[PDB]
Amino acid sequence: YVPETLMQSVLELEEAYKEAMEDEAFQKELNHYLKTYVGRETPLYFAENMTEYCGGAKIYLKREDLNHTGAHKINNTIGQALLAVRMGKKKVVAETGAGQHGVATATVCALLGLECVIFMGEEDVRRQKLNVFRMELLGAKVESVAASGTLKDAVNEALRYWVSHVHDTHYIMGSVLGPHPFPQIVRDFQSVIGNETKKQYEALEGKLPEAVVACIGGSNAMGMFYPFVHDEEVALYGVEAAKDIGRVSYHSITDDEALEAFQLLTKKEGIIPALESSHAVAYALKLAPQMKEDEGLVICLSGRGDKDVESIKR
Amino acid sequence: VPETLMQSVLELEEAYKEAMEDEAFQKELNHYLKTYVGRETPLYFAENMTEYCGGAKIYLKREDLNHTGAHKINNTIGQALLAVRMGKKKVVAETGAGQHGVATATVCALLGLECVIFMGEEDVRRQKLNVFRMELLGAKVESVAAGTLKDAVNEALRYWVSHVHDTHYIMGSVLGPHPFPQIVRDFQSVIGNETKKQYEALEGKLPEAVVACIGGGSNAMGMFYPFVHDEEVALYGVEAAGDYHSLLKDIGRVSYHSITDDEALEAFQLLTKKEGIIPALESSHAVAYALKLAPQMKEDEGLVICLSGRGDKDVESIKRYM
């Protein structure tokens, strides 16, 4: 049964995904790689100096920077790559902008023995030399898209590539920008973050956290927020640089505030956060002093501020 | 207060003994190892690497998954906590390539300790990343122009003795005076102890071989020591080519093997492509040696490689080479 159109490819993936989520063996294998390869569960760390400094709620850091790759994208890519393997596929195509999803895809393809083709707009390729080099070392073929040459164009080429090689190729999307069932699949695999956070926090405090804080970025916080979505007593704070069910209030942090948060976290907790994370920490630095001492606030940390020289130069 | 190295060391010896028998000390230590450092680290089965060599199963002890990306923190957190227990608010350390330095500054940031780190001039100028990490973490980095690791160790000793009243020396090198080699070995045994437990759980037996890097003041005794008495477990120390330590090698309990830069670079490319793990170049030497060993072992046999450090540091320098 081999698809000839994007619709048929999407339907093929729907059925495969539903079958997998009901096969206990699939989930068992996924958990095995999440444990021994990715390094889950990641710690929920009580930042006691930070807590003393703000003067309000207990502050906890969900350490997604301690995943293999140093970021949480891999939670999604490994789930999908295993799905690809389960579908009997031998290749993965993906698209990437800054490179995080690309590197994360190339990584699990190396792991699982899958060929890997990554589409990237020429503009992004020009300004992500090391990430591109990382992807190639991981064995991936990187295709520079000039058709403008932005992320949108890379996506379109990836979709066409998927369809025309669909007999053996699966498309690993990192965005929740459709089509279905890609947003669901991504949300479900990313949910291990909020699910872990919930279980770990309960075990510590015997209740749910009063607040959870994460950077929005492009959808980034779906994994952390979704498991708490039906717990309305839990305030969800999406942070962006300077769904619509009303569960998430959004906030902007400037470059300067995020710099201060970066310095404080580094000096007070010995944790060097990436720039997006620093925006999250920065908002929490505004929120924590306003909350009570017997309350708890969780900040999601992702990405490493000291991965290489180019990154720490700031 | 002590005024001599001899007295400083006796003060340390007694403080260490008491801490080690304080159940509250072991509890706190384990708390930070779990929730801060992120132990236990996983023992990962490298299936592609295993198929490639066609011999023993190859497991990777993932010390790269610690906070900081290396295993030096296992020792710094133990001694920093010891410092707090001794009632000291300051810390001095030596560092060579900077890993120990960063792990020391990290834990001083965490526990609110002042940090002075001595580092040979030649090491300072070529460890830009690690120096910036140390400074960002709030440590004073003192360049030693005397200017190798030996000169930094001596300068750290001099500083310690002079400031012994409120300063503890967190040593990472195992070539220093008693009881530092014992303390570092004990704190690092969490690597070997975990490995043995995780491997037995999986295989119902002990590894036929354990492979680990040595040098730069490091001993890999944290990984090797818990296996020393299991004589059927071969112990391999790997260096960069350029009953019951030096004893262990002399009587043949442990054997030492050198790996070239080209062999190391090859293993670095292989691990990346086969496992999606980009290793530090140092660690690659151990991977390179395991590549020579694995094919000569049986399929029903097993080998563990201690993997430490994050290779993302080295990608920039390697790209230039290629």
From Swiss-Prot, chain A:
| UniProt entry keywords in alphabetical sequence | Amino-acid biosynthesis, Aromatic amino acid biosynthesis, Lyase, Pyridoxal phosphate, Tryptophan biosynthesis
Q: Which metal ions or organic cofactors does this protein require, according to UniProt?
A: pyridoxal 5'-phosphate
Q: What is its EC number?
A: 4.2.1.20
Q: Which domain of life is it from?
A: Bacteria
| Location of N6-(pyridoxal phosphate)lysine modifications | K73
Could you say which enzyme class this protein belongs to? Answer: lyase
The catalytic activity, as recorded, is:
(1S,2R)-1-C-(indol-3-yl)glycerol 3-phosphate + L-serine = D-glyceraldehyde 3-phosphate + L-tryptophan + H2O
Name the pathway: Amino-acid biosynthesis; L-tryptophan biosynthesis; L-tryptophan from chorismate: step 5/5
List the InterPro entries hit by this protein, alphabetically.
Trp_synth_b_CS, Trp_synth_beta, Trp_synth_beta/beta-like, TrpB-like_PALP, TrpB-like_PALP_sf
Any matching Pfam family = PALP
> What GO molecular function annotation could you give as one example from this UniProt entry?
tryptophan synthase activity
Q: What biological function has been recorded for the protein in this entry?
A: The beta subunit is responsible for the synthesis of L-tryptophan from indole and L-serine.
Which family does the record claim for this protein? Belongs to the TrpB family.
Name of the protein described by the UniProt record? Tryptophan synthase beta chain
- Which gene is the coding source of this polypeptide chain? trpB
